[PDB]
Design a protein around this nucleic acid. Structure first.
Ligand SMILES: [Mg+2]
Ligand SMILES: [Mg+2]
Ligand SMILES: [Mg+2]
Ligand SMILES: [Mg+2]
Ligand SMILES: [Mg+2]
Ligand SMILES: [Mg+2]
Ligand SMILES: [Mg+2]
Ligand SMILES: [Mg+2]
Ligand SMILES: [Mg+2]
Ligand SMILES: [Mg+2]
Ligand SMILES: [Mg+2]
Ligand SMILES: [Zn+2]
Lengths: 214, 140, 24, 64, 49, 102
RNA sequence: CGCAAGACGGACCAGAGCGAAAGCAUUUGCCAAGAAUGUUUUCAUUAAUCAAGAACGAAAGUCGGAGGUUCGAAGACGAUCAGAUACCGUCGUAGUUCCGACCAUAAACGAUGCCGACCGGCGAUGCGGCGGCGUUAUUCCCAUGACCCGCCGGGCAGCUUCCGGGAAACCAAAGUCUUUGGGUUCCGGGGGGAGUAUGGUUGCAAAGCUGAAACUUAAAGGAAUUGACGGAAGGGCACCACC
């Protein structure tokens, strides 16, 4: 008979301060009672949100995962948990008569956050191309994948998780793959399709607070 | 308004967002709706909970009646914007959504409910789980 | 009949022939 | 809230439809924004060149 | 045990070599009685795993 | 006798092709022998889009499509009326039906 | 939200590639192997096809050890039926997966032996190589990548043709055949009985290879034509159809 939502209470989930829209949305949870505390009921929770509302004037076909780590009263803060593309984009990306390229790498950033990377790429037909299809020889696919592997690992090593996300929202890393792999085979839509998180180093609160603060 | 304590402290201009997991497969239709996380569900209705005919569970008639009950429950609570997550049976089974996907979507729109991004979350495999048909298939 | 069911029926007929012959 | 009433003049008719000939298509305009015209699906005899009422401008129209 | 006599075994005895009672025995059976399959959750050819 | 030069399949230089299962009856057919349908239909029932756009939180929001590749056996295919029996001279033609653009 | 397990590698994926066939599709590395191309390199007839003999051989099946997620013979049940030992539904053993050892069968098909020569045309495609306006990548130029126009060789094919052939369907091979002979294996002789019996041999078994006769029958078959029909599609028509 008792309405559970009378027992529940609403928090607000806040993205990292490096994001211009800090407000993600509002969630609900039961009030802290018994051995249950709304603190640890709130941590370990994900909030998928499209990049269009995360930034001001960027595309909508990219989404982020945003695991929650603390509760600050009404505030319950989150950080980057994983990025992916809208499946409608992905299925529209694939097409016949051109070869899709896939690669992955598992790299450790300088702060102890190790990431699993997924990148996709497709070959372009030229403006004057008259052959119906545009394929790549197997060895070409190897070497464009090998270079897309090494620039992906080289960029994460030199920098940290803070500097990896700021340059990830524009997906400017995808622009410098095709800017240098064009000389070996012209690709036209290359994106990092997915990123997945595997380990969280020691839960350093000072690093989380300061990225969420000044 | 006021409700009172149910639903968060909101202003006039802004709105609160939810997600509707619309599982409109064949043989049934689900218009589940949850919070933005996905796990603290608010109102769960299915086509079968309304039609008593045991065969119209995926019919369009069952589809919008279930959705409006979710729709009516949303305004009772306070949730007013909804991202929509379509999904079919998926897996090794069929990928096209059933006949109740559209009728339930129409009901939300005619119930005056803001709709955000629309995505389909049909579980697609990487060529796994050999399909239950046998070699010669369903020879009906 | 289907030929393959003829081939199957005759195979099971030969098996019965071999059993009786081994008996005798 | 609801758009008020409007009137529509019918230009050349684009044949019957509805799979039994119950409805026809008319390609009407609003005699005020006479440049902007839409195709409409109506039932009954047309009188190509007459005027007909309209509540909502852009409802729908499918191609035959 | 079926080849023994009723003194040496619960299964012993009889004009035909047979158990004469379920070979599954309860776990709390007294020592001297729990012979055969002890507290068996199932019997048979064990097909499937 | 031989109804078609190729035997109903696009197999010319290889020995074996992977069997794939019909999406309607779940019968496995060779991949080259299947009837492929690529539907790029919208998930919105275009007859009922205006309210969705009217009820959208955003104004210039682009509606998403639905891209599903669809496989049939020829037993299910002609039953579903996706392919049809044709005359002998018309049967040996591989140009797809027109897109009906105008 | 995680977790664990075992299978399977979608969409890219094509009348595209590779392999003697069976067959082969996530990334990376290692191991040996192969065609084609290029060669004013080498040997100099070393070659073609091949009884006996040998290597490999889908799936199912067998034996031993792991694993058993999904499907699923057998089996159970619910339906359907007049009946329903089936189709459909829910379970579900063997099996499906891996390792090792057997079997050697498929519509194992291109229902088309291999090597060689000749006999029309056209547009493509994959690989290699040889050229050419130009675009492009970056660069500071050249190669080199991607594209365009050709070409040479080897492949998978396709379109067309009164080359010719064929019973025709059709085939640029199934042509160069009464104007009958390039070389060389296998193999058929009306339909059944019958791939049966028996003998031999292989196999753990299932079964494999070799393989008749008695007797019975006037046809059985192949390609095309017409009609009839269809619980096959498509246009048209009708207030004894509808609106
Ligand atoms: Mg049928
Ligand atoms: Mg005794
Ligand atoms: Mg006793
Ligand atoms: Mg006894
Ligand atoms: Mg007794
Ligand atoms: Mg095998
Ligand atoms: Mg099952
Ligand atoms: Mg086994
Ligand atoms: Mg074969
Ligand atoms: Mg010869
Ligand atoms: Mg004979
Ligand atoms: Zn089918």
């Amino acid at each position: 008979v008792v309405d559970p939502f009378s027992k529940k209470d609403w928090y607000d989930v806040k993205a990292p301060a490096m994001f211009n829209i800090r407000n993600i949305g509002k969630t609900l949870v039961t009030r802290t009672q018994g051995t249950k505390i709304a603190s640890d009921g709130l941590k370990g929770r994900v909030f998928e949100v499209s990049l269009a509302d995360l930034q001001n004037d960027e595309v909508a076909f990219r989404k982020f995962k945003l695991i929650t780590e603390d509760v600050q009263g009404k505030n319950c803060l989150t950080n980057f948990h994983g990025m992916d593309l809208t499946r409608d984009k992905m299925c529209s990306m694939v097409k016949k008569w051109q070869t899709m390229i896939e690669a992955h790498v598992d790299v450790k950033t300088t702060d102890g956050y190790l990431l699993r990377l997924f990148c996709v790429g497709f070959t372009k037909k030229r403006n004057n191309q008259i052959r119906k299809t545009s394929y790549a020889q197997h060895q070409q696919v190897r070497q464009i994948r090998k270079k897309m592997m090494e620039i992906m690992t080289r960029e994460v090593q030199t920098n940290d998780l803070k500097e990896v996300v700021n340059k990830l929202i524009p997906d400017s890393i995808g622009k410098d793959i095709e800017k240098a792999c064009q000389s070996i085979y012209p690709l036209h839509d290359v994106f990092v399709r997915k990123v997945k998180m595997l380990k969280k180093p020691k839960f350093e609160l000072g690093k989380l607070m300061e990225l969420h603060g000044e | 308004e006021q409700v009172i304590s149910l639903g968060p402290q909101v202003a006039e201009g802004e709105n609160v967002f939810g997600v509707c997991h619309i599982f409109a497969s064949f043989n049934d239709t689900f218009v589940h709706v949850t919070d933005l996380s996905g796990k603290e569900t608010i109102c769960r209705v299915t086509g079968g909970m309304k039609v008593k005919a045991d065969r119209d569970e995926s019919s369009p008639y069952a589809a919008m009646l279930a959705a409006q009950d979710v729709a009516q429950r949303c305004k009772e609570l306070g949730i007013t914007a909804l991202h929509i997550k379509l999904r079919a049976t998926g897996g090794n089974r069929t990928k096209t959504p059933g006949p109740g996907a559209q009728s339930a979507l129409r009901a939300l729109a005619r119930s005056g409910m803001k709709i955000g991004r629309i995505e389909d979350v049909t579980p697609i495999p990487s060529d796994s789980t050999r399909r239950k048909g046998g070699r010669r298939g369903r020879r009906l | 009949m289907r030929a393959k069911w003829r081939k199957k029926r005759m195979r099971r007929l030969k098996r019965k022939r071999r059993k009786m012959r081994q008996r005798s | 809230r609801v758009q008020p009433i409007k009137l529509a003049r019918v230009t050349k008719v684009l044949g019957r439809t509805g799979s039994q000939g119950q409805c026809t298509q008319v390609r009407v305009e609003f005699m005020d924004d006479t440049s902007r015209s839409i195709i409409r699906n109506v039932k009954g005899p047309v009188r190509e060149g007459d005027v007909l009422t309209l509540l909502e401008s852009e409802r729908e129209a499918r191609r035959l | 045990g079926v080849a023994m006599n009723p003194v040496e075994h619960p299964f012993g005895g009889g004009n035909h070599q047979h158990i004469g009672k379920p070979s599954t025995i309860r776990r709390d059976a007294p020592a001297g009685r729990k012979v055969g399959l002890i507290a068996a959750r199932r019997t048979g050819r064990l097909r499937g795993t | 006798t031989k109804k078609r030069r190729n035997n109903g399949r696009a197999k010319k230089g290889r020995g074996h092709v992977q069997p794939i299962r019909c999406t309607n009856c779940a019968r496995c057919v060779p991949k080259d022998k299947a009837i492929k349908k690529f539907v790029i239909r919208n998930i919105v029932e275009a007859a009922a889009v205006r309210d969705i756009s009217e009820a959208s939180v955003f104004d210039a929001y682009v509606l998403p499509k639905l891209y599903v590749k669809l496989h049939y056996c020829v037993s299910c295919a002609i039953h579903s009326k996706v392919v049809r029996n044709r005359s002998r001279e018309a049967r040996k033609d591989r140009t797809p039906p027109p897109r009906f653009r105008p």
